[PDB]
Amino acid sequence: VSGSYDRTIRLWRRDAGHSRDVYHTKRMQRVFRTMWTMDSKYILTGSDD
Amino acid sequence: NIIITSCVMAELEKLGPRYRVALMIARDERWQRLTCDHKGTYADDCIVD
Amino acid sequence: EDLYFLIKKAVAVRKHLERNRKDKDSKFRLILIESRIHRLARYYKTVGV
Amino acid sequence: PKVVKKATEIKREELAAIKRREENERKHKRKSEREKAVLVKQQ
Amino acid sequence: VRTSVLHDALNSINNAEKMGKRQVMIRPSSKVIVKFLQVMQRHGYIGEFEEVDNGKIVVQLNGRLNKCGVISPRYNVRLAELEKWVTKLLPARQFGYVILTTSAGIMDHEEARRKHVAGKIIGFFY
Amino acid sequence: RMFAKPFLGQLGNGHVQGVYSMCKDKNSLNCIASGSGDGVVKVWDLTTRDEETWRVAAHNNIVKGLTFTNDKKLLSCATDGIKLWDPYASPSNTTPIATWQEGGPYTSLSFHRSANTFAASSGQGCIRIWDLEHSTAGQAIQWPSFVDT
Amino acid sequence: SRQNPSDLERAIAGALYDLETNTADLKAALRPLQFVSAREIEVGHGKKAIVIFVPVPALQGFHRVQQRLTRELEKKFSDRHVLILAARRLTAVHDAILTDLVYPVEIVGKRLRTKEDGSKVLKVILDEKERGGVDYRLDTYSEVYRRLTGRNVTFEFPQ
RNA sequence: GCUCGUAGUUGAACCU
RNA sequence: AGCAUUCGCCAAGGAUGUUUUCAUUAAUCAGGAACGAUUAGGGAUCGGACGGCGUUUAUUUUUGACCCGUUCGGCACCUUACGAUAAAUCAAAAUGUUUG
Ligand SMILES: [Zn+2]
């Protein structure tokens, strides 16, 4: 997972090269931190909103 | 005591970072966050309901 | 210094118009360089010279 | 969204030009695009 | 002619903050600018700077910065009327600061009242 | 594509200013802490997401570093230095229980897996090694003539 | 003249006399030169450093020869770093002290950066074209400059 | 129609 | 307002580059006068300077035409406005809805 300076989370694989899925809302401003939970199912997003 | 529904903070957050001052004054932690549960996030019908 | 090439250029344009006094756009070049004579003669007179 | 779509289109066209003049300025093996990350390596 | 190096530099901060840039390049430097960035950096609204002379000021900035101020008529301000001036400049008094030119240095208005000095309003930033 | 609904939700009423550092407990799964741009750190539980478990105005500018220790305690870096907090105490202590400022402008922070040790990325181009409960000042390791943050 | 010379200032002047007789095949700065001034302070610990000073307008007179002159000085005296420096009587004074420290390659650019507080560090970039012994002596240039003038600088080749 | 131009107007930084 | 054959002469002027200098001379306009801070880059346009993992001039060195890169300086197109706002005007009417 990567959190962008603009309004997007990028879901990648280890061996992908291009983004498996992308995440955005209108209410999420600038994602500064993005980390997993400790089962690998959910992803957790701290933004500038 | 002023109460601010999550429809209202939802609409202020949907309005872009032009209004980041109005959001940062709207999330005053003094105030009663009145959590609503209905699908719309439409403030005028939440308030009249 | 600069002022001698200014008066060489300016009196040269004056001699050109004294060869033909009907070239009015070169007469405008004369009033440009004469305006520079008023300018740098004024400022470099107020330096002390 | 709209701004991310526009800006990644602008990045596509800009990298298209930069690789175009990269190939012309080459023209007048290669180095791999993963090898064009490590600038230097100190001991 | 734009002799206002501060108004130019802070137009660069404003427009290259709404742009979504992540560092600006300000080649006309000063000491009012560097001390202005000392204050804003001390309150964390710009990330970092670095001056590399030829007078380049490179400002790694963060992103929360709403608006940095452009007051040209730098007025004297009483310490008793400074509440009126700060409540006219800042959109909310707990958000942002007002850059004061004092004889004890240049600092925010809250630290200016921590040192009990009245000065001159030059800036605001929030 | 039809059932791509990725958004679960929101950890309660959130912070006031933007969340600029957050961390997770590698031993738990639901201890989520996040420090915004007021210094105020908050601690949530992922089961109980309508409200935060703990809340303190920890620093003044922002919270740069944030991590959990191996026992239950957290750690925060800011420009004001670094504080060690007990988020889980039955007398709920809003006051910190350790601090460090010998160093410099600490700009991030990370914690060891097994043994009680953490390092902080400073502003002097250095990282500090603290081994908890028997270290006053951390060991300093830096690249020898290194200047940048 | 100005100084009552030390035993090691007359060891340096003794090396100057040893570059007046039984030597090269060159004397453009070796034939007129007398004693001026010298100091000698450690580079950290382990080895010391030797500096001499300059009568101010004669810096082109010390640009008569300095290449291989400091090589003869480092051979014949104490195997330590030998450095020339101009003492004067502050801005362009100490900037000129820096440009007299690093004499072959001139300064490219002063990079005084700050950290996320009031702190700030000066670090000036020097041109790449001479690096071989300069990466050795660059610590000595920095710590000589803070041990003598007083402020905190570091030097770097740019990237 | 445009241009030069004066009073006026605003006057680079740098130096306990 | 305008500027269209060739050639000569007369002076200006622009642009580039320099290893050039008195060093504030600067910037905008009442009184008056002659003539009638970035957009965000891409692809093209020339006017230079530098370079060539290329042809041709060339009997081979100059040299020039073509192709490429950097680079400035301008005349316009296109989208998004970085925004605006009085709209019909826009890469400027961007800075008249958190005005300094
Ligand atoms: Zn509702």
From TrEMBL, chain A:
Location of the protein in the cell: Nucleus, Nucleolus
Transmembrane residue ranges: none
Chain positions of WD repeats: 24-49
Family of this protein: Belongs to the WD repeat DCAF13/WDSOF1 family.
Protein name (database record): DDB1- and CUL4-associated factor 13
Taxonomic source organism: Chaetomium thermophilum (strain DSM 1495 / CBS 144.50 / IMI 039719) (Thermochaetoides thermophila)
Location of this fragment in the whole protein: 299 to 347 of 446
Automatic annotation (TrEMBL), chain C:
Coiled-coil ranges per UniProt: none
Family of the protein in this entry: Belongs to the universal ribosomal protein uS15 family.
Domain of life of the native organism: Eukaryota
Protein name per the record: 40S ribosomal protein S13-like protein
Lineage: Eukaryota, Fungi, Dikarya, Ascomycota, Pezizomycotina
Automatic annotation (TrEMBL), chain E:
Molecular functions per Gene Ontology: structural constituent of ribosome
Sorted UniProt keywords: Ribonucleoprotein, Ribosomal protein
Listed InterPro entries: Ribosomal_uS8, Ribosomal_uS8_CS, Ribosomal_uS8_sf
UniProt GO BP: translation
Source taxon at top rank: Eukaryota
Short name of any one Pfam family annotated for the protein: Ribosomal_S8
GO cellular component: cytosolic small ribosomal subunit
Family: Belongs to the universal ribosomal protein uS8 family.
Protein name according to UniProt: 40S ribosomal protein S22-like protein
Species this chain originates from: Chaetomium thermophilum (strain DSM 1495 / CBS 144.50 / IMI 039719)
Lineage: Eukaryota, Fungi, Dikarya, Ascomycota, Pezizomycotina
Automatic annotation (TrEMBL), chain G:
One Gene Ontology CC term in the entry: 90S preribosome
PROSITE patterns per record: RIBOSOMAL_S7E
Pfam families, A to Z: Ribosomal_S7e
Any one GO biological process: ribosomal small subunit biogenesis
Transmembrane segments: none
Domain of life from the UniProt record: Eukaryota
Annotated GO MF terms: structural constituent of ribosome
Keywords from the named record: Ribonucleoprotein, Ribosomal protein
Family: Belongs to the eukaryotic ribosomal protein eS7 family.
Protein name, entry field: 40S ribosomal protein S7
Biological source species: Chaetomium thermophilum (strain DSM 1495 / CBS 144.50 / IMI 039719) (Thermochaetoides thermophila)
